[PDB]
Design an enzyme around this catalytic site. Structure first.
Site, PDB file in Angstrom:
ATOM      1  N   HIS A 182     -23.978  65.262  23.326  1.00  0.00           N
ATOM      2  CA  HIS A 182     -25.299  64.546  22.485  1.00  0.00           C
ATOM      3  C   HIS A 182     -25.373  62.926  23.149  1.00  0.00           C
ATOM      4  CE1 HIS A 182     -22.589  62.486  19.477  1.00  0.00           C
ATOM      5  NE2 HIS A 182     -23.613  61.721  18.988  1.00  0.00           N
ATOM      6  N   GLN A 197     -21.787  55.300  14.525  1.00  0.00           N
ATOM      7  CA  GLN A 197     -22.630  55.235  15.653  1.00  0.00           C
ATOM      8  C   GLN A 197     -22.145  54.344  16.817  1.00  0.00           C
ATOM      9  OE1 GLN A 197     -26.538  54.338  14.523  1.00  0.00           O
ATOM     10  NE2 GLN A 197     -27.446  55.738  15.961  1.00  0.00           N
ATOM     11  N   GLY A 198     -22.281  54.710  17.937  1.00  0.00           N
ATOM     12  CA  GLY A 198     -21.896  53.803  19.093  1.00  0.00           C
ATOM     13  C   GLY A 198     -20.335  54.217  19.488  1.00  0.00           C
ATOM     14  N   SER A 247     -19.475  57.460  19.491  1.00  0.00           N
ATOM     15  CA  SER A 247     -19.664  58.863  19.774  1.00  0.00           C
ATOM     16  C   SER A 247     -19.193  59.082  21.152  1.00  0.00           C
ATOM     17  CB  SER A 247     -21.277  59.625  19.734  1.00  0.00           C
ATOM     18  OG  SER A 247     -21.382  59.761  18.534  1.00  0.00           O
ATOM     19  N   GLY A 248     -18.363  60.156  21.557  1.00  0.00           N
ATOM     20  CA  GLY A 248     -18.161  60.515  22.934  1.00  0.00           C
ATOM     21  C   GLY A 248     -16.770  60.047  23.155  1.00  0.00           C
ATOM     22  N   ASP A 285     -19.754  70.119  21.338  1.00  0.00           N
ATOM     23  CA  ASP A 285     -20.446  68.585  21.609  1.00  0.00           C
ATOM     24  C   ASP A 285     -19.174  67.991  22.649  1.00  0.00           C
ATOM     25  OD1 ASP A 285     -21.862  66.506  21.677  1.00  0.00           O
ATOM     26  OD2 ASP A 285     -21.293  65.696  19.767  1.00  0.00           O
ATOM     27  N   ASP A 328     -13.419  54.748   9.242  1.00  0.00           N
ATOM     28  CA  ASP A 328     -13.916  55.948  10.056  1.00  0.00           C
ATOM     29  C   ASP A 328     -14.562  55.500  11.473  1.00  0.00           C
ATOM     30  OD1 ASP A 328     -16.708  58.020   8.713  1.00  0.00           O
ATOM     31  OD2 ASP A 328     -15.086  58.443  10.306  1.00  0.00           O
ATOM     32  N   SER A 329     -14.969  56.351  12.079  1.00  0.00           N
ATOM     33  CA  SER A 329     -15.770  56.082  13.333  1.00  0.00           C
ATOM     34  C   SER A 329     -17.243  56.068  12.838  1.00  0.00           C
ATOM     35  CB  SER A 329     -15.376  57.070  14.479  1.00  0.00           C
ATOM     36  OG  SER A 329     -15.791  58.328  13.836  1.00  0.00           O
ATOM     37  N   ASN A 360     -14.396  42.951  26.167  1.00  0.00           N
ATOM     38  CA  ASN A 360     -15.809  42.363  25.610  1.00  0.00           C
ATOM     39  C   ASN A 360     -17.055  42.964  26.406  1.00  0.00           C
ATOM     40  OD1 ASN A 360     -18.013  40.901  25.355  1.00  0.00           O
ATOM     41  ND2 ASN A 360     -16.696  39.076  24.514  1.00  0.00           N
ATOM     42  N   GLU A 387     -12.725  44.710  34.729  1.00  0.00           N
ATOM     43  CA  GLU A 387     -13.668  45.756  34.785  1.00  0.00           C
ATOM     44  C   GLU A 387     -14.166  46.488  36.212  1.00  0.00           C
ATOM     45  OE1 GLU A 387     -14.337  42.419  34.126  1.00  0.00           O
ATOM     46  OE2 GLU A 387     -14.965  42.256  31.959  1.00  0.00           O
ATOM     47  N   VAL A 422     -19.528  40.346  28.105  1.00  0.00           N
ATOM     48  CA  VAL A 422     -18.867  39.249  29.248  1.00  0.00           C
ATOM     49  C   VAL A 422     -18.097  39.648  30.245  1.00  0.00           C
ATOM     50  CG1 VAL A 422     -17.453  37.137  29.283  1.00  0.00           C
ATOM     51  CG2 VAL A 422     -18.958  37.637  27.031  1.00  0.00           C
TER      52      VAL A 422
HETATM   53  N1  LIG Z   1     -18.986  59.099  10.474  1.00  0.00           N
HETATM   54  C1  LIG Z   1     -18.668  59.427  11.462  1.00  0.00           C
HETATM   55  N2  LIG Z   1     -17.432  59.529  11.839  1.00  0.00           N
HETATM   56  C2  LIG Z   1     -19.551  59.234  12.659  1.00  0.00           C
HETATM   57  C3  LIG Z   1     -19.117  59.533  14.041  1.00  0.00           C
HETATM   58  C4  LIG Z   1     -19.790  59.376  15.007  1.00  0.00           C
HETATM   59  C5  LIG Z   1     -21.030  59.255  15.100  1.00  0.00           C
HETATM   60  N3  LIG Z   1     -22.331  59.261  15.654  1.00  0.00           N
HETATM   61  C6  LIG Z   1     -23.241  59.072  14.867  1.00  0.00           C
HETATM   62  C7  LIG Z   1     -24.617  58.871  15.578  1.00  0.00           C
HETATM   63  C8  LIG Z   1     -25.700  58.396  14.912  1.00  0.00           C
HETATM   64  C9  LIG Z   1     -26.954  58.356  15.072  1.00  0.00           C
HETATM   65  C10 LIG Z   1     -28.479  58.097  14.818  1.00  0.00           C
HETATM   66  C11 LIG Z   1     -28.798  59.355  13.965  1.00  0.00           C
HETATM   67  N4  LIG Z   1     -29.845  58.901  12.948  1.00  0.00           N
HETATM   68  C12 LIG Z   1     -27.088  58.450  16.568  1.00  0.00           C
HETATM   69  C13 LIG Z   1     -26.179  58.856  17.582  1.00  0.00           C
HETATM   70  C14 LIG Z   1     -26.515  58.948  18.853  1.00  0.00           C
HETATM   71  C15 LIG Z   1     -25.792  58.036  19.719  1.00  0.00           C
HETATM   72  C16 LIG Z   1     -26.158  58.144  21.095  1.00  0.00           C
HETATM   73  C17 LIG Z   1     -27.032  59.083  21.680  1.00  0.00           C
HETATM   74  C18 LIG Z   1     -27.830  59.744  20.819  1.00  0.00           C
HETATM   75  C19 LIG Z   1     -27.514  59.834  19.350  1.00  0.00           C
HETATM   76  C20 LIG Z   1     -24.764  58.852  17.075  1.00  0.00           C
HETATM   77  O1  LIG Z   1     -23.906  59.206  17.885  1.00  0.00           O
HETATM   78  N5  LIG Z   1     -22.987  58.828  13.496  1.00  0.00           N
HETATM   79  C21 LIG Z   1     -21.912  59.075  13.632  1.00  0.00           C
HETATM   80  C22 LIG Z   1     -20.905  58.801  12.355  1.00  0.00           C
HETATM   81 CA   LIG Z   2     -16.383  42.392  29.684  1.00  0.00          CA
END
Ligand SMILES: NC(=[NH2+])c1ccc2[nH]c(-c3cc(CC[NH3+])cc(-c4ccccc4)c3[O-])nc2c1
Ligand SMILES: [Ca+2]
Length: 223
Positions: A40, A174-175, A177-178, A84, A171-172, A54, A62, A57
């Site tokens: 995704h 958004q951001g 992911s992957g 996924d 927990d992990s 960072n 890098e 910066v």
């Molecule tokens: N609770 C967790 N362990 C968790 C882990 C990974 C997640 N990744 C996300 C995630 C949420 C959103 C917004 C959905 N309303 C978007 C993305 C997203 C990131 C990059 C590209 C497309 C969607 C997420 O990976 N939530 C997450 C929650």
């Molecule tokens: Ca840097």
């Protein structure tokens, strides 16, 4: 990462940042020319940033390399997030050292209670957004299939596992992911999804990497 700590520059040498003019997903370096991430997170125009700490910066260490191709698993379902996983081939190989290095793929799946390290530059608030400049870390255990299934009934496939704390707070998010879930020095999971971030009884769900080892090797071998 919510409830985690600052990893320390370059202490997680296989962590990469996927950038399209801003950081949007994490990934793991498995060889000098390949990265594993989540399907995704796919998009065109990806720049892979290795040896980062960072992300706002340039501080030294890098390496920014463009992605040559991205291979999303052919059975990936964006509605269930089953399978996924995605492989990204780099345009040129990375220079591996102690600050940039690959992680090993597993030879067996891990069991519940195994303790793992999850890292990333994802949100640090369960309620609102606050994205960090430096890499965050969290130690979390793999939970039992029954606890996972009980938490997300009808939503867990055999290609997923839960890890975290049912009591919430860590927990992990958004951001992240992957990004990598490493246990005993082997890449066991890929940060995939969850219901919110760090909520009680809603642990994170991760792609079960041991079920893709042969696919990963076969695909890298033919590309
Ligand atoms: N609770 C967790 N362990 C968790 C882990 C990974 C997640 N990744 C996300 C995630 C949420 C959103 C917004 C959905 N309303 C978007 C993305 C997203 C990131 C990059 C590209 C497309 C969607 C997420 O990976 N939530 C997450 C929650
Ligand atoms: Ca840097």
């Amino acid at each position: 990462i919510v409830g985690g700590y600052t990893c320390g520059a370059n202490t997680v040498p296989y962590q990469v940042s996927l950038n399209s003019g801003y950081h949007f997903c994490g990934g793991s370096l498995i060889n000098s020319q390949w990265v594993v991430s989540a399907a995704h997170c796919y998009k065109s125009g990806i720049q892979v940033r290795l040896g980062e700490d960072n992300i706002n910066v340039v501080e030294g260490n890098e390496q920014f390399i463009s992605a040559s191709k991205s291979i999303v698993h052919p059975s990936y379902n964006s509605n269930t997030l089953n399978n996924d996983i995605m492989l990204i081939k780099l345009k040129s190989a990375a220079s591996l050292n102690s600050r940039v290095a690959s992680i090993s793929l597993p030879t067996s799946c891990a069991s519940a209670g195994t303790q793992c390290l999850i890292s990333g530059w994802g949100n640090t608030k369960s309620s609102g957004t606050s994205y960090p400049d430096v890499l965050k870390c969290l130690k979390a255990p793999i939970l039992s299939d029954s606890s996972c299934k009980s938490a997300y009934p009808g939503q867990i496939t055999s290609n997923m596992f839960c890890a975290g704390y049912l009591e919430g707070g860590k927990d992990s998010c958004q951001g992240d992911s992957g990004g990598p879930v490493v246990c005993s020095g082997k890449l066991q999971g890929i940060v995939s999804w969850g219901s919110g971030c760090a909520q009680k009884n809603k642990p994170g769900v991760y792609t079960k990497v041991c079920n893709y080892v042969s696919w990963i090797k076969q695909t890298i071998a033919s590309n």
